Design a protein around this ligand. Sequence first.
Ligand code: FAD
Ligand code: FAD
Lengths: 438, 438
Amino acid sequence: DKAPSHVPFLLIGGGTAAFAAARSIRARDPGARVLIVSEDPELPYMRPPLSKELWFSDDPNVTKTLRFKQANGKERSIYFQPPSFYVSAQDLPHIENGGVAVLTGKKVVQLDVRDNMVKLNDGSQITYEKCLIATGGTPRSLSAIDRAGAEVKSRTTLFRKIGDFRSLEKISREVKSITIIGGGFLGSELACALGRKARALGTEVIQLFPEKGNMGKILPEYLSNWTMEKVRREGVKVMPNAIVQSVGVSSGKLLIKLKDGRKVETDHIVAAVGLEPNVELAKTGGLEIDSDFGGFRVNAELQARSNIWVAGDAACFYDIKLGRRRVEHHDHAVVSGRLAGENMTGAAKPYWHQSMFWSDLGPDVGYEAIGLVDSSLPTVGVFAKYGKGVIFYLRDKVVVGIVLWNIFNRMPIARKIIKDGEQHEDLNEVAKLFNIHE
Amino acid sequence: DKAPSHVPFLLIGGGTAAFAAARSIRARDPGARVLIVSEDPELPYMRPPLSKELWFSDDPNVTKTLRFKQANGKERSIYFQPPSFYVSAQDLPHIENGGVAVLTGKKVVQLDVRDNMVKLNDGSQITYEKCLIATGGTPRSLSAIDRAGAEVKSRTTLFRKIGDFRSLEKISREVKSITIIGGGFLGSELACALGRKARALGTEVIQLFPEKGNMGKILPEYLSNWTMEKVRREGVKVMPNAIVQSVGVSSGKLLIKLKDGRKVETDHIVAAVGLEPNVELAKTGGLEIDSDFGGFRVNAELQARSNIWVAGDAACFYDIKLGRRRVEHHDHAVVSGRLAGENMTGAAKPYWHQSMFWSDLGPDVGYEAIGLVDSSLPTVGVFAKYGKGVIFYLRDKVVVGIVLWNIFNRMPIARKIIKDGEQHEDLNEVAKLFNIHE
Ligand SMILES: Cc1cc2nc3c(=O)[nH]c(=O)nc-3n(C[C@H](O)[C@H](O)[C@H](O)COP(=O)(O)OP(=O)(O)OC[C@H]3O[C@@H](n4cnc5c(N)ncnc54)[C@H](O)[C@@H]3O)c2cc1C
Ligand SMILES: Cc1cc2nc3c(=O)[nH]c(=O)nc-3n(C[C@H](O)[C@H](O)[C@H](O)COP(=O)(O)OP(=O)(O)OC[C@H]3O[C@@H](n4cnc5c(N)ncnc54)[C@H](O)[C@@H]3O)c2cc1C
């Protein structure tokens, strides 16, 4: 309840990276006292289920329980730990053997790097010995929607939190037409999710984006096209090559006008058009932000200053093997958050273990990716029963990124390929490492 | 001298930044053991005298003694400390209360960050606890000269080291014409030095550069032009707007041909056209280079990795007040080197004290500078008795750089102006702080 005046380990933001760092610290410093300061009233929880498993649950009380069944059939909660796992912030300095506390509903509004101090929105001040910035990011919006009136904004969801899942799940049961703007994995996952729900009600789900196919920036054109067909088969009207010119309300309906002259009538909009790193604290903290990738600029060890690290979506870090990056993946927040916790306890380790990404777009599509995955890089695809396959992303004749298409339990192989940096003469032989033959 | 297997503090490079760090480390830890590895045969020495005082010495043995009198008339050596200040590398781990050693004539060729180890050109391996990279930079040459024959290269000086001063000084007494290429402070300082020698000796000194006038990139056009006139008054033939097309030999002499119709014939060429940061070790070390400014990319505390720092000309650092920069100034090497040393002894403080710059172009021109000094920025100059004046460099209606023209003992005032960063209603009133009125 009441924030202590001083804490050894202070973690800013109560998300995935923060929780991984808290567990990492406690593992290496058993009696450590870690304080997470989270503006969100919720305790740390994982987000991937918010766009997937929580929508495919048979339990009608899922919106209340926030529980789901994993791939192996085991049921669990999206929260990393139950409330009993944590200690209260007030008892954190006094409790024997320390623990992990979460100060929910409180925002760090000022970072005093000189005096190792943070100021909260309620005027409280907390001094620290080692600080992790794990603020993640805010979902971006459209300028066309920003310029629109207040009703348009109130009928637009920026999907990221538990509150967005509950509000949107209720909307899906109240309106007849939901439009998703954005072709990325998130927008495509929400389209498949709302798509399955729409079938029970006979409602409409629309997805439009500027690219020529789903994940146009990520997957090569041919696979992006195939994926778009699978999204359509999930009960989605996909409108590629769509750039939003303006948005307004006409007779109660939302009217989306595209630059190509087309117009779309809908009841509600979901905007999935990228993430904005939360770097407000860089101003008072005098911390550097990366102008190319956004976010806090940190080195290979995720360190910004003597006792300040950054992990998760907010951390623009230097990859020794792949260059400066900023990754927005669940496993990355775990890996980078875990790494930060180790470095905050003297590990002095650099980012080395490459984190992975995954996405599920209906039952027939499951993606796993790792490394530099971008459609503008040269690509070589090897497939077998359309069906499954691997896509290698090349730079300087070396594989720097891999996308696995309906191939599971083989990420270590992909990680080793990127690691060794070997110049392969025939990627067909390399595809056999992923059980792709013929 | 032989290198130990281990040393607590390892400084790569034996220049100004390295010495300032060694002095700083020892000041903080009077028992520290510091090893400087220098590819140069010389002990650490300051460079500004190589283009100024050493050429105006009243001692005809200056080229051998390398001693000179400062502005206050106090004689001293170009070396930071005499050999008695240092100990041998072999005895460094065994001498009680440690000391500072300089491994001369050895080049670190490999940096193994993982194992905190370096490899020398002779195969020796040295492990460290904390490491500073102070490798400075190599003088840049001209493509036109790179294309010329070996004889042309043999008669071109890349002025930077003690050997270049001795070689060029010997030449000035053996040839009839020397040509300096480059309009910066270095080229201009050398022009004034050789020009004075040419006065009471009967020889020619030529300076040519593509800019409209000396320090075209630094000073405003009107002040650059005024400075060019006084360099000429020192006995120099200044040829602005000169772009070299080729360099060849003609009857034993060097014939420079500019892109325009002009042609210059001289006996010797001195090239002073910028510096190339020495970042060879970034490859094996897995260290990040700055593609914009060059050099190693470090944070505000001059840190690159957990136990690696960078200082001096080779350090691209984050200036909390002015942004990311890389400065190539003597005082910067001292300030950043000693700040590095402090941070290598647990200080953990950012670059906050702004370093200054100076240049002497004859007896009637004394420049001092601080902050972001760039002719492409908007400037406001205030002058009194042409005489003296101050040049304010503005960004966002705030002073970010100051050049003082024949105004001394007032750098703390210029530093304070840049520190406060307040929008001034009238810069004339600010100029009064520098004793400029009417
Ligand atoms: C709906 C959804 C589905 C996803 N699905 C997948 C998937 O299938 N696969 C995959 O690999 N990745 C997926 N991701 C990405 C993954 O969830 C993110 O990379 C991960 O959540 C990043 O965690 P984080 O801790 O870095 O940031 P966050 O989880 O955003 O944590 C930051 C927290 O700090 C708080 N905060 C911010 N500023 C302050 C402040 N000043 N003071 C206090 N608190 C502050 C924020 O409110 C927030 O609660 C998904 C993301 C979303 C949103
Ligand atoms: C002639 C001259 C005049 C100048 N006059 C002025 C002036 O009036 N005012 C001013 O402000 N600045 C002046 N400067 C600039 C100032 O001298 C520099 O900013 C300063 O020398 C930078 O010091 P440093 O230690 O960073 O680099 P350096 O002095 O270049 O030190 C680097 C050293 O490390 C060595 N080294 C490099 N790589 C390795 C390796 N792998 N292993 C081992 N050793 C290595 C190099 O050989 C060199 O000896 C002048 C410079 C010159 C050359």
